[PDB]
Amino acid sequence: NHNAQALNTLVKQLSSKFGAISSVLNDIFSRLDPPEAEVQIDRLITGRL
Amino acid sequence: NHNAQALNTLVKQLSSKFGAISSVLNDIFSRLDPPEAEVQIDRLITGRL
Amino acid sequence: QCVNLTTRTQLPPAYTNSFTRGVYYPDKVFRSSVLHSTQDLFLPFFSNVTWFHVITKRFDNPVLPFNDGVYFASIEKSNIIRGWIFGTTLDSKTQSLLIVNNATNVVIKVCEFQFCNDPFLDHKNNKSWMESEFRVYSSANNCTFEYVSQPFLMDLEGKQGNFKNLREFVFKNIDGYFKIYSKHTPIIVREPEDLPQGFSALEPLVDLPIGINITRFQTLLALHRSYLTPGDSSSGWTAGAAAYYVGYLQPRTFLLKYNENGTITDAVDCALDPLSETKCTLKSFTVEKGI
Amino acid sequence: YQTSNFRVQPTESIVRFPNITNLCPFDEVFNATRFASVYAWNRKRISNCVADYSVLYNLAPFFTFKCYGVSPTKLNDLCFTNVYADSFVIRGDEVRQIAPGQTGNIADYNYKLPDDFTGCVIAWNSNKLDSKVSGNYNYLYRLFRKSNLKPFERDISTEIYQAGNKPCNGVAGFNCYFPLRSYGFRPTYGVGHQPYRVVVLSFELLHAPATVCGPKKSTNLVKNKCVNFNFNGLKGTGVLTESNKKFLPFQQFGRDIADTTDAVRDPQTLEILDITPCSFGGVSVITPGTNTSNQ
Amino acid sequence: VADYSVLYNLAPFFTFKCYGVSPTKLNDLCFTNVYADSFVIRGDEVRQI
Numbered sequence: 036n037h038n039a040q041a042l043n044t045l046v047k048q049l050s051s052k053f054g055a056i057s058s059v060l061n062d063i064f065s066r067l068d069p070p071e072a073e074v075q076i077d078r079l080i081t082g083r084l
Numbered sequence: 085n086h087n088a089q090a091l092n093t094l095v096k097q098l099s100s101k102f103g104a105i106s107s108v109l110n111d112i113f114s115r116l117d118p119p120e121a122e123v124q125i126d127r128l129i130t131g132r133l
Numbered sequence: 134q135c136v137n138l139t140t141r142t143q144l145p146p147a148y149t150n151s152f153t154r155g156v157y158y159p160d161k162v163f164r165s166s167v168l169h170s171t172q173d174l175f176l177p178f179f180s181n182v183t184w185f186h187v188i189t190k191r192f193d194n195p196v197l198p199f200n201d202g203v204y205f206a207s208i209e210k211s212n213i214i215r216g217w218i219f220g221t222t223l224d225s226k227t228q229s230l231l232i233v234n235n236a237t238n239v240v241i242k243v244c245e246f247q248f249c250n251d252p253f254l255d256h257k258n259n260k261s262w263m264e265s266e267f268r269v270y271s272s273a274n275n276c277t278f279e280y281v282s283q284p285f286l287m288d289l290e291g292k293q294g295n296f297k298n299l300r301e302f303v304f305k306n307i308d309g310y311f312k313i314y315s316k317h318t319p320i321i322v323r324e325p326e327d328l329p330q331g332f333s334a335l336e337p338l339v340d341l342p343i344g345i346n347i348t349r350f351q352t353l354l355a356l357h358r359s360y361l362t363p364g365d366s367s368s369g370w371t372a373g374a375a376a377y378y379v380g381y382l383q384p385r386t387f388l389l390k391y392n393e394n395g396t397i398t399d400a401v402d403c404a405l406d407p408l409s410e411t412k413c414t415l416k417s418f419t420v421e422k423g424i
Numbered sequence: 425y426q427t428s429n430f431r432v433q434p435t436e437s438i439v440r441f442p443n444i445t446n447l448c449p450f451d452e453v454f455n456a457t458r459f460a461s462v463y464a465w466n467r468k469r470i471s472n473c474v475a476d477y478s479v480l481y482n483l484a485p486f487f488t489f490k491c492y493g494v495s496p497t498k499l500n501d502l503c504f505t506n507v508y509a510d511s512f513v514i515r516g517d518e519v520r521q522i523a524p525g526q527t528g529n530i531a532d533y534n535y536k537l538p539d540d541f542t543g544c545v546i547a548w549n550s551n552k553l554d555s556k557v558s559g560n561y562n563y564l565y566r567l568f569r570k571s572n573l574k575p576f577e578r579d580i581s582t583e584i585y586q587a588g589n590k591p592c593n594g595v596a597g598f599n600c601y602f603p604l605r606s607y608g609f610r611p612t613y614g615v616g617h618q619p620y621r622v623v624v625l626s627f628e629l630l631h632a633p634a635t636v637c638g639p640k641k642s643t644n645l646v647k648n649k650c651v652n653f654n655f656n657g658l659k660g661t662g663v664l665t666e667s668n669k670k671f672l673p674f675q676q677f678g679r680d681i682a683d684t685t686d687a688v689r690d691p692q693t694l695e696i697l698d699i700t701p702c703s704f705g706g707v708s709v710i711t712p713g714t715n716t717s718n719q
Numbered sequence: 720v721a722d723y724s725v726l727y728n729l730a731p732f733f734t735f736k737c738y739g740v741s742p743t744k745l746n747d748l749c750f751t752n753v754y755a756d757s758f759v760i761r762g763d764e765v766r767q768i
């Protein structure tokens with residue numbers, strides 16, 4: 036039970052924004068210029084780490 | 085002794101700004117416009133987590 | 134034009150119970166075999182909804198408030214209820230919205246109407262069942278929005294048998310958008326008009342950018358006038374059996390369950406009980422022994 | 425030892441947009457004879473047309489072009505829905521007051537933007553059009569009201585405000601204000617009082633069947649191969665396959681537990697496809713030590 | 720304190736033309752060292768208001 040629960044929690048934490056405008060990387064890269072997309076992607080990367 | 089000290093540290097850790105302009109939520113919300121107040125608030129939230 | 138319709142009695146408001154009614158799809162995404170938690174304006178479970186009848190002759194159509202939204206349901210048989218008016222003063226001094234259904238097609242207008250004392254509809258010509266008279270407003274001077282939907286054909290049929298039409302609507306007004314959700318159901322009633330139990334989800338229908346301030350509303354009814362209705366436009370009319378219920382939305386948090394095909398089949402109101410609070414914290418519909 | 429992961433690479437790229445022909449009516453908006461007043465601003469619906477970004481840059485100088493939630497450069501690569509254009513005219517001093525979250529006469533009594541606004545604001549100076557030598561007085565505004573407006577609302581009612589108590593009730597004497605005023609636009613005031621033309625475009629993205637989207641060409645559709653797909657601006661990489669699901673008419677995408685798209689409606693033939701990562705692996709290498717062999 | 724309670728509500732007011740502060744929150748907003756010019760002009764000079 037402990038193993039299955041831990042893995043499911045890890046899989047489900049992927050649908051969080053961490054302050055960014057979206058939880059999808061491709062969508063952040065679209066509709067934004069690089070020097071602004073870098074901040075959002077930084078947020079996402081730190082959260083998942 | 086150990087338990088008391090740990091709790092004191094945890095409680096007193098609530099008066100740090102972690103780089104934001106202030107440690108009071110209502111003070112951050114006012115005096116700033118929302119789209120940049122939110123980054124300060126997220127800074128505080130990450131520190132406390 | 135406007136006539137004064139007297140000869141209808143005064144009675145106190147009747148109340149009934151909402152057995153988990155008034156839930157709608159909150160988004161436009163497909164999901165299946167999942168439990169999803171949402172926060173919005175819903176109708177609380179087991180609420181007291183106001184109950185109106187059109188059966189003396191009991192023509193109740195008062196001017197009702199509009200706090201944060203409205204759940205409107207109507208059990209009927211011959212399409213007596215047709216539409217609604219929304220506004221703040223309704224006296225030509227401020228804009229007002231109008232939704233009507235003629236015998237042909239839907240009409241939506243946001244104009245500075247001057248609504249007179251009693252709006253209604255007439256004719257119901259014997260043996261022909263045709264609609265010809267339209268008595269709602271007196272003038273519509275300045276306005277900006279207007280819409281006439283697709284043409285359809287209302288049979289304008291009368292009915293006195295077992296009720297078979299239950300139509301549910303949800304009305305919301307936020308950020309300049311007027312949102313409508315709808316659902317239909319054929320029901321066997323056999324019983325004293327008490328809002329059958331069950332579960333059913335409403336689906337989005339229309340979004341309008343009207344942009345007005347709304348505080349009150351009221352229902353439009355068509356009236357039955359032929360030979361068995363002796364008298365003029367104030368007395369010579371028939372009722373026809375119909376009933377409709379009104380409830381108000383409030384900000385809640387709900388837990389929803391999608392089956393494998395993608396239809397919402399169950400729900401949990403997280404502010405109803407302590408046990409609902411427990412389920413809504415655990416994100417499950419079953420709980421085991423403990424604290 | 426564990427070294428790396430093997431990974432199949434994509435073969436080709438495809439594109440799938442809807443087929444719409446006519447251009448959008450941006451002419452009627454930016455080239456109107458006269459603009460409406462700020463207290464009775466206008467709103468037009470733009471739908472079912474191919475948008476464009478070059479024509480603006482091609483016409484008269486349109487400075488102060490600032491967007492929220494999307495960069496101005498990328499507007500031609502996207503697919504929109506529910507596009508609306510609000511146009512009006514103000515003095516050149518108050519153009520800073522058009523932003524999400526602000527204060528001032530216009531923001532509180534004439535035109536409020538929602539705090540989560542996503543869209544673009546354009547403003548440019550107009551003296552050869554709106555200012556006349558004796559001063560144009562057809563452009564009015566509102567100065568008095570009980571409470572602030574909610575986002576995207578208008579008020580055209582005209583009645584005397586009662587600043588103090590004891591309402592005067594339609595005599596319009598002092599202790600009572602007529603809520604509407606007028607701008608003086610003599611062509612001599614200076615930069616800080618010139619009449620400026622403002623247009624606000626609003627829309628929302630990638631969550632419903634779209635109708636207004638930019639100029640691009642469609643490619644044929646290929647199934648059962650690791651490819652680079654792009655459906656209405658939703659880029660991705662993977663394998664596509666015909667589905668068994670059943671979408672309702674108002675749905676276009678489908679999501680899974682991790683909140684990642686895994687089903688999609690093809691916007692030319694209206695069929696449902698399923699998206700899957702193409703390959704994964706782990707590689708481990710067994711060696712007996714380089715002191716013994718190199719095999 | 721700059722209480723204008725018996726100012727905004729006075730009848731004999733003809734020209735209170737205030738260009739950066741709405742006459743309602745005069746009290747809800749502060750100022751700094753105040754310096755008031757009291758003098759007279761004629762009607763052919765109310766242009767100067």
Ligand SMILES: *[C@@H]1O[C@H](CO)[C@@H](O[C@@H]2O[C@H](CO)[C@@H](O)[C@H](O)[C@H]2NC(C)=O)[C@H](O)[C@H]1NC(C)=O
Pocket residue numbers: 235236237238240264281
């Ligand atoms: C219900 O209202 C609609 C909207 O006004 C009516 O349809 C229009 O009627 C006017 C009346 O002359 C015509 O000029 C329009 O051409 C009609 N709109 C169309 C055909 O799209 C409708 O007729 C009304 N119902 C009845 C029974 O008359």
Ligand SMILES: *[C@@H]1O[C@H](CO)[C@@H](O)[C@H](O)[C@H]1NC(C)=O
Pocket residue numbers: 274275464580
């Ligand atoms: C509203 O109607 C009145 C009377 O017809 C007219 O004087 C006024 O200009 C109108 N207002 C608008 C905003 O059209």
Ligand SMILES: *[C@@H]1O[C@H](CO)[C@@H](O)[C@H](O)[C@H]1NC(C)=O
Pocket residue numbers: 392393394
């Ligand atoms: C779902 O769809 C399948 C296939 O069409 C059907 O057999 C089934 O009855 C539907 N309902 C449920 C609850 O599975």
Ligand SMILES: *[C@@H]1O[C@H](CO)[C@@H](O)[C@H](O)[C@H]1NC(C)=O
Pocket residue numbers: 221346347348571572573574
């Ligand atoms: C809407 O109307 C009510 C009643 O007239 C009023 O109190 C309210 O302030 C209005 N809404 C706004 C945003 O002013």
